Paper text:
ATP synthases use a transmembrane electrochemical proton motive force (pmf) to generate adenosine triphosphate (ATP) from adenosine diphosphate (ADP) and inorganic phosphate (Pi). ATP synthases are macromolecular machines consisting of an ATP-hydrolysis-driven F1 motor and a proton-translocation-driven FO motor. The F1 and FO motors oppose each other’s action on a shared rotor subcomplex and are held stationary relative to each other by a peripheral stalk. In Saccharomyces cerevisiae, the FO region contains subunits a, e, f, g, i/j, k, 8, part of subunit b, and the c10-ring of the rotor, while the F1 region includes a trimer of catalytic subunit αβ pairs and subunits γ, δ, and ε from the rotor.
Residue numbers in the entry:
A (entry chain V): 117 to 173
B (entry chain Z): 1 to 48
C (entry chain U): 54 to 105
D (entry chain Y): 1 to 37
E (entry chain T): 26 to 249
F (entry chain 6), K (entry chain 3): 2 to 75
G (entry chain 7): 1 to 73
H (entry chain 8), I (entry chain 5), J (entry chain 4): 1 to 75
The structure:
């Protein structure tokens, strides 16, 4: 747990990072993106529930 | 009126339809899934 | 004739630099901030759990 | 960033593309007919 | 080649730049420039989810996105003072419209058989006026064929033509003796107001095309 | 050349048909704003209904415009 | 010759004017639909068939004008 | 000669104008139907035959215009 | 000849008549906006975009007429 | 010549007709302004700038029409 | 000769534009009377706005009229 805290201390993006690095550490990223393109969706469920939905009307 | 008639119609339409098919594929395979990468990455951060 | 169109376009860019460029700066900034804050909040959220 | 993710909806856009070919051909003939006017 | 061909190339390269190098460091927070193409993404997600339901809306989401973006970009580029129109070449816009109308009709026939023709009885009515309501439904269905294109084409063309005619007129207005060149700015300002309007109706038309052919796809996907 | 003159006249007359549709379009949208302001919540159902109505009203105007073009091109 | 062919084109132009009435008519039906539905809420499903019928009849007047244009052409 | 043929066509075109008022009229009767049914919730059974009656009478005016248009057109 | 150049000018004049319907139309949308906003107060967040949309389309009908006027006159 | 010069004046006269619609348009906007303000006593601070937009836009249709009248008249 | 005749005819046609303003003024004044009769007391604020509206409505008719004089004299 000391190590886990330390692991979070020396790496923690919230400044900016490549989307490639999040893809690299979690290939779950590419799995979900591919599954959504395959499914015929372009809505990411939950994205709109804590990020905007940028529309006026 | 003849002013809205060029005879270059087929020239216009050829380059025109080439641009549409190009933009359609370009969005569909590349740039639309590249936005979906931002969204999905944001949601994974949301989970963690 | 066609130089009039260029003068109006220059005037249009004048309105843009007056009104739109700071507004769009503020708009872009606002959204970017909100995203950043959500992301950092989630990072915070898991750090708390480790401590628990 | 840019990575190709297959969109299998390019083959769902088959009725659109068939229509496109017909109009493309038809405008060739229309251009030839209008240049004889 | 042709002037038209040269500006179609410019459109392709502009659209490429909006995703290729909008970001610096491929941000997870999103660049300030990329906020624009996020808002566009979200309002068209919510627009074609707004019209067509199912998970089938995402199946037509690129089609509605490139019909948005083409018209959105081509009603900014075509408004540049010396840039050579692609939208005032109506033959490209109208041909695309006829293509989409046929590609809706073919899709509807393919997906929904000869009960596609149930689209043209859109309500139970007295039996002697069941056929009347087929005739003037089919009439209105290929009025949709030309309406979608011709609306956009006329607006953009009219904008350029209005602006150029008044520009040519205001040159000779300033040529009138100098007491007329005092208050020679008031027509120049009018041309500016018109140029502003052409952008407005150009962004609105990009939405109007894409909502109307979202409505037409709603009709095509779900009968009636 | 009387025919050519006349073609230009017939076309001019054709614009008159468009005026009615121009008003019509505004009336549909007026109704939209009115309905929505009265109900609030009706808007999500009504906005699609409105878009359909816009197209139908527009189509009459399209016919008037098309006849103008038919004359214009001859 | 010249006068008769000329007259056909002119007469056709006049016929378009008749369509305008239908254009206004159709708008009135849809306006009424929106007003009725916003007033009631729940009426809409009953009203929508009535509206389609009313739309058709309004359009029909314009159609008569349109076919007369075709006769002149 | 030419003038007489021309005149027949002109008169036909002019007559087409008459129909427009009937067009607007038909809509007005139906607008009232919609508003009435939404107003009452229940007027519809009495009012629907009334609406048809009003429609028919309004329509008939346009029909008269139309037959005169044909009469001038064909001679 | 004299007649043809004249006919361009005359035909254009007639074409300009079409614009009046759009002009009144635009005002009707803005009236509805003002009425709506005063009626609800707070509807405006949805409705102001709707009204601008309605403005545009009313205007567009006018532009069709305008472009035809130019087409006859200027060629 | 005489016919072409004549056609400038006649064509201009016909063109002047379109202006009436913009006049009515402005009246509708101001009527709505009054109507809204009388309901609320207090909508006005929002509604007055909205009304100026409506005025300008309706007026613009008139100015386009007036331009065409001048193009026919003056050349 | 024909040019003189044409300008008199054209002057007539242009006068029709005034028609809209004559209606227009009344629509503003009607709303004034309706508003003040509704409120009993809006009038102090509303009356300036109403006079602004009157002037503008009339002004469009005056554009028609100055064109009418440009035809009539010219």
């Amino acid at each position: 747990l000391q190590s886990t805290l330390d692991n979070i201390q020396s790496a923690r993006p919230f400044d900016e990072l490549t989307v490639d690095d999040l893809t690299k550490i979690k290939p779950e990223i590419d799995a979900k993106v591919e599954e959504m393109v395959k499914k015929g969706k372009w809505d990411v469920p939950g994205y709109k529930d804590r990020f905007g939905n940028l529309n006026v009307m | 009126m003849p002013q809205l008639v060029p005879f270059y119609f087929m020239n216009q339409l050829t380059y025109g339809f080439l641009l549409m098919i190009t933009l359609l594929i370009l969005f569909s395979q590349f740039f639309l899934p590249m936005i979906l990468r931002l969204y999905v990455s944001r949601l994974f951060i949301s989970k963690l | 004739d066609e130089s009039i169109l260029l003068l109006t376009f220059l005037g249009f860019t004048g309105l843009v630099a007056k009104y739109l460029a700071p507004a769009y700066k503020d708009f872009a900034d606002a959204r970017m901030k909100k995203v950043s804050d959500v992301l950092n909040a989630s990072r915070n959220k898991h750090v708390e759990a480790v401590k628990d | 960033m840019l990575k190709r993710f297959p969109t299998p909806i390019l083959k769902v856009y088959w009725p659109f593309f068939v229509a496109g070919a017909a109009v493309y051909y038809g405008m060739s003939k229309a251009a030839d007919l209008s240049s004889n006017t | 080649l042709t002037t038209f061909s040269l500006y179609t190339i410019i459109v392709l390269l502009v659209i490429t730049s909006l995703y290729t190098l909008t970001n610096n460091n491929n941000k997870i927070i999103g660049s300030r420039w990329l906020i624009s193409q996020e808002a566009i993404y979200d309002t068209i997600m919510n627009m074609t989810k707004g019209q067509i339901g199912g998970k089938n809306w995402g199946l037509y989401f690129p089609m509605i996105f490139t019909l948005f973006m083409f018209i959105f970009i081509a009603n900014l580029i075509s408004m540049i003072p010396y840039s050579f129109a692609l939208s005032a070449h109506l033959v490209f816009i109208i041909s695309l419209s006829i293509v989409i109308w046929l590609g809706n009709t073919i899709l509807g026939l393919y997906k929904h058989g000869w009960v596609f023709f149930s689209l043209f009885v859109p309500a139970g009515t007295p039996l002697p006026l069941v056929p009347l309501l087929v005739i003037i439904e089919t009439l209105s269905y290929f009025a949709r064929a030309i309406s979608l294109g011709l609306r956009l084409g006329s607006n953009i063309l009219a904008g350029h033509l209005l602006m150029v005619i008044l520009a040519g007129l205001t040159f000779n207005f300033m040529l009138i003796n100098l007491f007329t060149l005092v208050f020679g700015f008031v027509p120049l300002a009018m041309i500016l107001a018109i140029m502003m309007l052409e952008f407005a109706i150009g962004i609105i038309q990009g939405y109007v095309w894409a909502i109307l052919t979202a409505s037409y796809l709603k009709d095509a996907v779900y009968l009636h | 050349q009387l025919v050519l003159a006349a073609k230009y006249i017939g076309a001019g007359i054709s614009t008159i048909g468009l005026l009615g549709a121009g008003i019509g379009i505004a009336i549909v949208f007026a109704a939209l704003i009115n309905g929505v302001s009265r109900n609030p919540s009706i808007k999500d159902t009504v906005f699609p209904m409105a878009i359909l109505g816009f197209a139908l009203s527009e189509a009459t105007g399209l016919f008037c415009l098309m006849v103008s073009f038919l004359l214009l091109f001859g």
